[PDB]
Amino acid sequence: AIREDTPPGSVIQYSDYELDTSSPYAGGAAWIEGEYVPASEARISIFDTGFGHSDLTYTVAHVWHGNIFRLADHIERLLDGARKLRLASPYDETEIAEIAKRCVGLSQLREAYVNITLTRGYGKRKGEKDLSKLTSQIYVYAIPYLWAFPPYEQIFGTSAVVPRHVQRAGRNTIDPTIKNYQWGDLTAASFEAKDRGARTGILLDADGCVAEGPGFNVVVVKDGALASPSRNALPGITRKTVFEIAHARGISAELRDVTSRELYDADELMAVTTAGGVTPITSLDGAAVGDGEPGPITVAIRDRFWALMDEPSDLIDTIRY
Amino acid sequence: GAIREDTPPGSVIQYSDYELDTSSPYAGGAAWIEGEYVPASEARISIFDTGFGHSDLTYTVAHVWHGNIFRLADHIERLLDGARKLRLASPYDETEIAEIAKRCVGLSQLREAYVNITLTRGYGKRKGEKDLSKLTSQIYVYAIPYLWAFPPYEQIFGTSAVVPRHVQRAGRNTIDPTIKNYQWGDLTAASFEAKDRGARTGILLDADGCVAEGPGFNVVVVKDGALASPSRNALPGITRKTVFEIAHARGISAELRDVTSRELYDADELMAVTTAGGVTPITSLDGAAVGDGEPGPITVAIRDRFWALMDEPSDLIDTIRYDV
């Protein structure tokens, strides 16, 4: 399915277009080992140490209405993280962008989820343990748009818990600031949230400050100001965008430690991520956040984020199909 | 591939000499994926398996020496116990998994081999579905030429380690070390730090400052003729289990407990235990000799008897039928 239901008045509306049924790449495109191939066919060698050791970094960029959003920023973030991992990219920035945009083209999707993965790769002999012998492998795929939170929740908000049983991985153990596939703590959080009947969980770090959720940054709105955790959390591109919008409106937006107490005391809570953008979190721990309905500042920031996808700018590049 | 490698001449570690029959494609590497056996060089999985995207998986590794696979049932029991902890459900049963693992070793034709069984959350027909129930779990098994966490000459003569200043092992409440996982971020950072310091490995610490499993290996500390190994934040190693059993048969006292870092420095002998290569002395820590700087008596005894264990008939060993 290349589209799914969204609220009628909503700022979020899918684009009307019919997939060609002739092209194999239509509706799913991936690029593996120097070849573009249909997503249904994409496979990687079990012996890639990025699977065996999750020795990888990734980024995802979203395309809405034919436009890729902040793709240059995402690739810059991917390469900064790889350098921290002493992981070396086979391709340069431009080359990676080139592959990504072609992928969306052959995918033929106005709305799509695009993943770029850089892994330590494999050497000649299976299971090799030497960094010297491995050569990094890049994997890129474009698939129908994916929602961290359902679109109806994007308009009307979502429910969350602070998980008691799991905490976010520390900066010195598995750095959350490098986007990674090592989701053990995050998956644990989601299981705890659904046992508690919430849709998600906001995790805390070792000192007890707010960290992030599974797949999203958390932004806390109080006294007409925005705060988001500065440590034990990814530097999300969606978060940077939300802060940019807030500064344009003249609202104070800061990255700092955020106490759990603040989380409970907040006027508005939002979850921000590349897949689905800006989500109101209307309830925390079974209790209403403020009114119980999406906060006005959250509403403003979300509505302008979706607007940004359509207005022409440096941030959005038009995919050519 | 190379079925063998050089081993020290006096050493208890000697490869079995045979030659691979080059006719078969499976010879030298066998794998089982999506319901069919395939040559290892051909083994691949869908990018969309959530075992990659989220590393939502558990695994175990068994070693084959001189034609016999070692404690394979214990390994499969541990894998599925962890899977139950992860709310991960296996498609195939205990017997079925053992059946596939041993067939992989047979078609491999390796009398010395590395066998991996991996259980993953898998992939829904929809690409990247977040719904747990919509996904269907996958079992992947592969048998490949033997791999050494430490080189055999290092098994006989010892190895070097540091405790990293910059990295800690993931805690029980973040990514459970007690479940075998591919989430090696902390472990990889540790190996990098040891290389920069010029040691071959690193012994990690937990949040309280107690010893934690070194990457790909449990740590055993010998002091005053007794064995201690970390009880919290270390995988329950089968090699460690065996090392403890041998210690009991020899009348050496062995306990699973918290080990303070100072204890690590104060030790008489240090050993590293894992399935891939067994028992390794750690002669030097942080660039200083551990005692004599030579493999410890207790360590040597348990190492030699471990390898001997591979050859004596027992319930621990099952003979692989390479006929196929």
**Tokens (6 digits) for A87:** 């992981």
CB contact under 8 A, B40 and A146: no
Q: Identify whether residues B157 and B99 lie together within a single domain.
A: no
What are the chain A neighbours of B54 within 8 Å (beta carbons)? 181, 183, 186-187
Distance between CA atoms of residues B156 and B306, nearest Å: 13
Q: Are B221 and B214 in contact (CB under 8 A)?
A: no
Number of CB atoms found within 10 A of residue A5's CB: 9
- Strand pairing partners for A121? none
Which residues span the domain enclosing A73? 29-144
Beta-carbon-side half-sphere exposure of residue A304 (alpha carbons within 13 Å): 14
| Short-list B153, B175, B194, CA closest to B286 | B194
**Tokens (6 digits) for B257:** 């407990």
Distance between CA atoms of residues B321 and B324, nearest Å: 8
| 3 state SS of B318 | strand
Look at strands B57-65 and A277-284 and give their pairing: unpaired
Domain with residue B228: its CATH number is 3.20.10.10
Q: Minimal Cα distance from A86: which residue of B?
A: B192
What are the chain A neighbours of B149 within 8 Å (beta carbons)? 129
Write the Ramachandran bin of B155: left for phi over 0, alpha for psi from -120 to 50, otherwise beta: alpha
Nearest to A44 among B44, B147, B176 (CB): B44
| Short-list A186, A149, A146, A78, CA closest to A302 | A149
Q: Are B57 and B120 in contact (CB under 8 A)?
A: yes
Last residue of a domain, one of B130, B147, B164: B147
Q: Are A14 and A123 in contact (CB under 8 A)?
A: no
In DSSP notation, B23-65 reads TSSSTT-EEEETTEEEEGGG-EEETT-HHHHS--EEEEEEEEE
Q: Identify whether residues A156 and A294 lie together within a single domain.
A: yes
**Which residue is associated with the tokens 């289990």?**
B241
Q: Identify whether residues B142 and B156 lie together within a single domain.
A: no
CB contact under 8 A, B144 and A126: yes
CB contact under 8 A, B145 and A139: no
Number of CB atoms found within 10 A of residue A14's CB: 16
B35 Cβ contact partners less than 8 Å away, ≥ 6 residues apart = none
Q: Identify whether residues A140 and A56 lie together within a single domain.
A: yes
- Strand pairing partners for A281? A158
**Tokens (6 digits) for A2:** 């290349």
Last residue of a domain, one of B117, B147, B177: B147
Best A33, A51, A146, A274 residue to mutate vs chain B (most B CBs within 10 Å): A51
Q: Identify whether residues B181 and B272 lie together within a single domain.
A: yes
Distance between CA atoms of residues B201 and B191, nearest Å: 6
Beta-carbon-side half-sphere exposure of residue B311 (alpha carbons within 13 Å): 9
| Short-list A9, A13, A39, CA closest to A27 | A39
Look at strands A316-318 and A67-69 and give their pairing: antiparallel
Q: Minimal Cα distance from B164: which residue of A?
A: A172
Alpha-carbon torsion A273, A276, A280, A284, what sign?
A: negative
Look at strands A252-256 and A225-229 and give their pairing: parallel
Q: Identify whether residues A183 and A301 lie together within a single domain.
A: yes
| Short-list A126, A29, A251, CA closest to B276 | A126
Distance between CA atoms of residues B41 and B117, nearest Å: 17
Tell me the nearest-neighbour CA distance from A90 into chain B, angstroms. 19
CB contact under 8 A, B44 and A39: no
Note the residue count of chain A: 321
- Strand pairing partners for A57? A118
**Tokens (6 digits) for A280:** 């109101």
Q: What is the resolution of this structure in A?
A: 2.8
How many inter-chain contacts (A to B, CB under 8 Å) are there? Answer: 130
**Tokens (6 digits) for A254:** 């800061």
Write the Ramachandran bin of A155: left for phi over 0, alpha for psi from -120 to 50, otherwise beta: alpha
Distance between CA atoms of residues A211 and A189, nearest Å: 12
**Which residue is associated with the tokens 């703590």?**
A185
B314 Cβ contact partners less than 8 Å away, ≥ 6 residues apart = none
Best A153, A158, A181, A203 residue to mutate vs chain B (most B CBs within 10 Å): A181
Distance between CA atoms of residues B115 and B137, nearest Å: 20
Helices within chain A (DSSP H only): 49-52, 71-84, 93-107, 151-156, 184-195, 237-248, 260-265, 296-310
Buried b (16+ CB within 10 A) or exposed e, B120-135: bbbbbeebbebebeeb
Q: Are A70 and A83 in contact (CB under 8 A)?
A: no
Q: Are A239 and A272 in contact (CB under 8 A)?
A: yes
For residue B175, what are the CA distances in angstroms to A167, B86, B202? Answer: 9, 11, 19
Alpha-carbon torsion B103, B106, B111, B113, what sign?
A: negative
| Short-list B107, B136, B91, CA closest to B42 | B107
**Tokens (6 digits) for A175:** 């750095």
Number of CB atoms found within 10 A of residue A39's CB: 23
CB contact under 8 A, A127 and B140: no
- Strand pairing partners for B203? none
Q: Minimal Cα distance from A28: which residue of B?
A: B127
Q: Are A270 and A301 in contact (CB under 8 A)?
A: yes
Radius of gyration of chain B (CA): 20
In DSSP notation, B275-323 reads TTTEEEEEEEETTEESTTSS--HHHHHHHHHHHHHHHS-SSSEEE----
| Short-list A169, A266, A253, CA closest to A223 | A266
Residue B202 burial by Cβ neighbours in a 10 Å radius (0-12, 13-18, 19+): buried
Residue numbers after which chain B is interrupted (C to N above 2.5 A) read none
What are the chain B neighbours of A50 within 8 Å (beta carbons)? 52
Q: Identify whether residues A159 and A125 lie together within a single domain.
A: no
- For residue A126, the 8-state DSSP code is T
| Short-list B18, B262, B290, B32, CA closest to B159 | B290
Number of CB atoms found within 10 A of residue A320's CB: 9
Beta-carbon-side half-sphere exposure of residue A244 (alpha carbons within 13 Å): 10
Residue B268 burial by Cβ neighbours in a 10 Å radius (0-12, 13-18, 19+): middle
Q: Identify whether residues A137 and A179 lie together within a single domain.
A: no
Beta-carbon-side half-sphere exposure of residue B45 (alpha carbons within 13 Å): 28
Q: Minimal Cα distance from B3: which residue of A?
A: A125
Buried b (16+ CB within 10 A) or exposed e, B14-41: ebeeeeeeeeeebbbbbbbbeeebbbbe
**Which residue is associated with the tokens 């039928």?**
B321
- B16 belongs to a structural domain: no
Overall number of domains in chain A: 2
Last residue of a domain, one of B108, B128, B147: B147
Distance between CA atoms of residues A12 and A25, nearest Å: 26
Q: Identify whether residues A45 and A182 lie together within a single domain.
A: no
Distance between CA atoms of residues A73 and A302, nearest Å: 20
